[PDB]
Design an enzyme around this catalytic site. Sequence first.
Site, mmCIF file in Angstrom:
data_model
loop_
_atom_site.group_PDB
_atom_site.id
_atom_site.type_symbol
_atom_site.label_atom_id
_atom_site.label_comp_id
_atom_site.label_asym_id
_atom_site.label_seq_id
_atom_site.Cartn_x
_atom_site.Cartn_y
_atom_site.Cartn_z
ATOM 1 N N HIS A 53 -12.623 0.828 -2.419
ATOM 2 C CA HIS A 53 -12.550 0.154 -1.110
ATOM 3 C C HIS A 53 -13.876 -0.493 -0.706
ATOM 4 O O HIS A 53 -14.524 -0.098 0.269
ATOM 5 C CB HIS A 53 -12.069 1.118 -0.020
ATOM 6 C CG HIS A 53 -10.623 1.508 -0.161
ATOM 7 N ND1 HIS A 53 -10.227 2.734 -0.658
ATOM 8 C CD2 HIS A 53 -9.482 0.827 0.111
ATOM 9 C CE1 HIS A 53 -8.906 2.796 -0.667
ATOM 10 N NE2 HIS A 53 -8.431 1.655 -0.202
ATOM 11 N N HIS A 62 -12.780 -5.605 -3.244
ATOM 12 C CA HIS A 62 -11.386 -5.368 -2.862
ATOM 13 C C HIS A 62 -10.982 -6.320 -1.724
ATOM 14 O O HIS A 62 -9.978 -7.026 -1.819
ATOM 15 C CB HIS A 62 -11.179 -3.913 -2.447
ATOM 16 C CG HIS A 62 -9.861 -3.652 -1.792
ATOM 17 N ND1 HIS A 62 -8.654 -3.941 -2.392
ATOM 18 C CD2 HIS A 62 -9.564 -3.107 -0.591
ATOM 19 C CE1 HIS A 62 -7.668 -3.585 -1.582
ATOM 20 N NE2 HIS A 62 -8.198 -3.089 -0.476
ATOM 21 N N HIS A 65 -10.058 -6.021 6.551
ATOM 22 C CA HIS A 65 -9.079 -4.949 6.760
ATOM 23 C C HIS A 65 -9.514 -3.547 6.291
ATOM 24 O O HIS A 65 -8.869 -2.573 6.673
ATOM 25 C CB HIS A 65 -7.758 -5.286 6.083
ATOM 26 C CG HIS A 65 -7.754 -4.977 4.621
ATOM 27 N ND1 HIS A 65 -8.321 -5.819 3.686
ATOM 28 C CD2 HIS A 65 -7.323 -3.890 3.945
ATOM 29 C CE1 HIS A 65 -8.187 -5.280 2.485
ATOM 30 N NE2 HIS A 65 -7.589 -4.111 2.612
ATOM 31 N N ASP A 66 -10.565 -3.459 5.464
ATOM 32 C CA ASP A 66 -11.101 -2.155 5.038
ATOM 33 C C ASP A 66 -12.571 -1.970 5.446
ATOM 34 O O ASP A 66 -13.279 -1.143 4.841
ATOM 35 C CB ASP A 66 -10.978 -1.980 3.518
ATOM 36 C CG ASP A 66 -9.635 -1.424 3.082
ATOM 37 O OD1 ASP A 66 -9.089 -0.539 3.770
ATOM 38 O OD2 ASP A 66 -9.132 -1.848 2.014
ATOM 39 N N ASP A 69 -2.797 -6.483 0.010
ATOM 40 C CA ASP A 69 -3.523 -5.227 -0.201
ATOM 41 C C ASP A 69 -3.249 -4.618 -1.579
ATOM 42 O O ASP A 69 -4.138 -4.019 -2.182
ATOM 43 C CB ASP A 69 -3.149 -4.247 0.911
ATOM 44 C CG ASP A 69 -4.261 -3.259 1.258
ATOM 45 O OD1 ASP A 69 -5.378 -3.347 0.702
ATOM 46 O OD2 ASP A 69 -4.020 -2.413 2.145
HETATM 47 C C1 LIG Z 1 -3.597 -1.725 -5.678
HETATM 48 C C2 LIG Z 1 -3.437 -0.232 -5.711
HETATM 49 C C3 LIG Z 1 -3.769 0.521 -4.486
HETATM 50 C C4 LIG Z 1 -3.619 1.856 -4.545
HETATM 51 C C5 LIG Z 1 -3.907 2.836 -3.442
HETATM 52 C C6 LIG Z 1 -4.916 2.293 -2.443
HETATM 53 C C7 LIG Z 1 -5.217 3.308 -1.374
HETATM 54 C C8 LIG Z 1 -3.923 3.802 -0.761
HETATM 55 N N1 LIG Z 1 -2.953 4.229 -1.748
HETATM 56 C C9 LIG Z 1 -2.351 5.455 -1.549
HETATM 57 O O1 LIG Z 1 -2.568 6.182 -0.585
HETATM 58 C C10 LIG Z 1 -1.400 5.995 -2.535
HETATM 59 C C11 LIG Z 1 -0.144 6.293 -2.054
HETATM 60 C C12 LIG Z 1 0.778 6.812 -2.931
HETATM 61 C C13 LIG Z 1 0.449 7.041 -4.249
HETATM 62 C C14 LIG Z 1 1.387 7.563 -5.117
HETATM 63 C C15 LIG Z 1 1.076 7.795 -6.438
HETATM 64 C C16 LIG Z 1 -0.186 7.496 -6.898
HETATM 65 C C17 LIG Z 1 -1.120 6.972 -6.036
HETATM 66 C C18 LIG Z 1 -0.812 6.743 -4.716
HETATM 67 C C19 LIG Z 1 -1.746 6.214 -3.849
HETATM 68 C C20 LIG Z 1 -2.616 3.275 -2.771
HETATM 69 N N2 LIG Z 1 -3.171 2.409 -5.712
HETATM 70 N N3 LIG Z 1 -2.961 3.714 -5.960
HETATM 71 C C21 LIG Z 1 -2.536 3.696 -7.224
HETATM 72 N N4 LIG Z 1 -2.469 2.453 -7.786
HETATM 73 C C22 LIG Z 1 -2.878 1.661 -6.814
HETATM 74 N N5 LIG Z 1 -3.016 0.320 -6.805
HETATM 75 MG MG LIG Z 2 -7.114 0.238 3.833
HETATM 76 ZN ZN LIG Z 3 -7.281 -2.511 1.365
#
Ligand SMILES: Cc1cc([C@H]2CCCN(C(=O)c3ccc4ccccc4c3)C2)n2ncnc2n1
Ligand SMILES: [Mg+2]
Ligand SMILES: [Zn+2]
Length: 341
Positions: A81, A85, A121-122, A233
């Site tokens: 983050h 990103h 946004h972050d 995102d």
């Molecule tokens: C572009 C992208 C962004 C993200 C995360 C960003 C921060 C918030 N995220 C979660 O809270 C989150 C929620 C549910 C999940 C379920 C299984 C594994 C990971 C998880 C992660 C998503 N992940 N996470 C894995 N691959 C990603 N690709």
């Molecule tokens: Mg965020």
């Molecule tokens: Zn973000």
Amino acid sequence: SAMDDEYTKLLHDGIQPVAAIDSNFASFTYTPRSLPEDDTSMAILSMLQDMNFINNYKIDCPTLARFCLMVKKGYRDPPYHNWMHAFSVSHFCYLLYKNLELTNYLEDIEIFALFISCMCHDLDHRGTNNSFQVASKSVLAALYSSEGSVMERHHFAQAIAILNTHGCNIFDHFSRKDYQRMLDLMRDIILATDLAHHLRIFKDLQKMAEVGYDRNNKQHHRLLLCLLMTSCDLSDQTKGWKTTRKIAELIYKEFFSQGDLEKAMGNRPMEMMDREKAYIPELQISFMEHIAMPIYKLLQDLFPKAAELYERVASNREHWTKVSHKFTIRGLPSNNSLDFL
Ligand SMILES: Cc1cc([C@H]2CCCN(C(=O)c3ccc4ccccc4c3)C2)n2ncnc2n1
Ligand SMILES: [Mg+2]
Ligand SMILES: [Zn+2]
């Protein structure tokens, strides 16, 4: 001071043509993380120029240069983050503008708000999630936990703090009504980045997709802005396998660092944040199946030209299945030693 000379050049050198950044800069196949970080603030200006926001909204160039640098400066450097990103999320917003004809769906000011929101946004992310703010009784939780979306409220507040910094309010010539509208949009769009919020409105998104987008429906605009923000995102997942493998590395490094902190606090981390328990291929498959794929399927449902994005995300999910077997150690390790036991 580094910002000051960077500002001087950003302001006085002129805005680079967006085509000069890269030959397929405006293609869904472009990977914005390939752009050197030192080049990204100029690229933001180039995209703003190419979407004609600078001229349409008569944005002051010194103010805009300062704002862009302040926003970049407002990101820390956790593994995921960070500014790169926010830059890549912003770039995907630009791609949506260039490829999907957003002007048939959204107001000009909504599209502008979406892009600025992407940049912001972050802001000031500390590499930990909302749950951790509460568990660790952070200052951010003290401020916002009663409302929820703790980090996202903070990102929004940080955005406003930048605008309220002298010389940085890119909107301060707006009418009082338009100013109020822009900040309200930023609130809604930044808060939509909380995946809990996405999951809550998911059925409404499906409903909108099935009845058909109504441009005269204010709630449909609101829903679409949420879906688009989420699509920006998560847009790393719409790129090639190499990109998404690298992003998995970044995400889990960040997540596991949080998990280590939770263990030290005497708290049992979520499995995806516990480096001793997390099985990354299965986790990524879960994220793709349960979160990413349905998001881009919705985008495809609404915008047929977005089909290739969903197809990429699906392809990336299948790649995790394919490589999973490589996470099991067969034969001996390369040092021929079983010391790791
Ligand atoms: C572009 C992208 C962004 C993200 C995360 C960003 C921060 C918030 N995220 C979660 O809270 C989150 C929620 C549910 C999940 C379920 C299984 C594994 C990971 C998880 C992660 C998503 N992940 N996470 C894995 N691959 C990603 N690709
Ligand atoms: Mg965020
Ligand atoms: Zn973000």
